[PDB]
Design a protein around this ligand. Structure first.
Ligand SMILES: Nc1ncnc2c1ncn2[C@@H]1O[C@H](CSCC[C@H](N)C(=O)O)[C@@H](O)[C@H]1O
Length: 291
């Protein structure tokens, strides 16, 4: 077995302290070990993000605009969690595909069947005015060109929507498929527990202060670093059994998940953090119908 003692998990990309040459053969390796794992990946990252905002006092009274939201099953859980916490939030979920009917019939959530474009983004901005907007994006078209096209759209989402915070899908194009250097919003590169086995995808979390929009350039050399850093993490780190982690499941992803969940706010008072996390994970797995 691959056992080890770890103080804490890598929470952000910059924390990954090692790299490995990418082995293309790893693409034939099982990408998922859990059923509904995708929805789980999304629920943890999104719960983490919004909890951070709650912590900063900028969630209550906001309208969360989720683009690329369908089916969005896990969103129902997120909605219930803050709704039960007494937090006032309106959800506007936009996608051209149909949403899970469990999201239907809640006066606090509006489902929209539309593929967004710069034009539509301007109409929704005019219609949401003057509520504060929190943007979440999970759109997916992928070729490098598809990616650049998506990232280009996420930047327009922010310039037009002008949100107080944003969570964007972020995956650097592969270096051997480089096209042109580009810019992405500045934010923390939140690592995702339960992401596919060899995914290099992460979530870029940002809080906007003032009227400034800071961006950062990304070049092929960064793409090379992204590849090796994410390959070492997937191949090595995520395959670790944290023996000093006293929990029903000691695999890295559960260790990483514990750290995200311990930041979530509950109505129920617990004696320890282990008790709250166990509670949250239990609730989460039950909702997703995960064993
Ligand atoms: N311009 C656009 N506007 C809205 N949705 C878009 C889009 N381009 C791609 N998408 C959507 O991005 C989605 C990618 S899958 C997203 C899964 C979703 N976040 C959930 O939690 O299940 C697709 O449903 C797709 O229709």
């Amino acid at each position: 077995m691959d056992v080890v003692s770890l103080d804490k998990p890598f929470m952000y990309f910059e924390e990954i302290d090692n790299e490995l040459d990418y082995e293309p053969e790893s693409a034939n390796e099982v990408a998922k070990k859990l059923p509904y794992q995708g929805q789980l990946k999304l629920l943890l990252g999104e719960l983490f993000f919004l909890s951070k905002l709650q912590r900063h006092g900028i969630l209550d009274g906001a309208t969360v605009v989720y683009i690329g939201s369908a089916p969005g099953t896990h969103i129902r859980y997120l909605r219930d969690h803050f709704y039960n916490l007494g937090v006032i939030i309106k959800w506007m979920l936009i996608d051209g595909r149909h949403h899970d009917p469990i999201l239907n019939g809640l006066r606090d959530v509006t489902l929209v069947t539309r593929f967004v474009d710069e034009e539509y983004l301007r109409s929704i901005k005019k219609q949401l005015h003057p509520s504060k907007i929190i943007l979440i994006s999970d759109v997916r078209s992928p070729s490098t060109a598809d990616l650049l096209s998506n990232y280009a759209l996420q930047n327009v989402m922010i310039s037009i929507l002008n949100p107080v915070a944003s969570s964007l899908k972020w995956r650097c194009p592969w270096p051997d498929q480089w096209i042109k250097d580009f810019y992405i919003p500045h934010g923390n590169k939140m690592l995702q527990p339960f992401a596919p086995s060899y995914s290099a995808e992460m979530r870029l979390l940002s809080i906007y202060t003032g009227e400034n929009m800071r961006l950062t350039r990304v070049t092929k050399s960064d793409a090379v670093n992204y590849e090796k850093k994410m390959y070492y993490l997937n191949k090595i780190v995520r395959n670790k059994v944290v023996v000093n982690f006293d929990y029903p499941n000691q695999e890295y992803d559960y260790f990483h998940m514990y750290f995200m969940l311990r930041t979530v706010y509950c109505n129920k008072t617990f004696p320890t953090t282990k008790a709250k996390v166990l509670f949250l994970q239990q609730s989460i797995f039950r909702f997703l119908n995960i064993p």
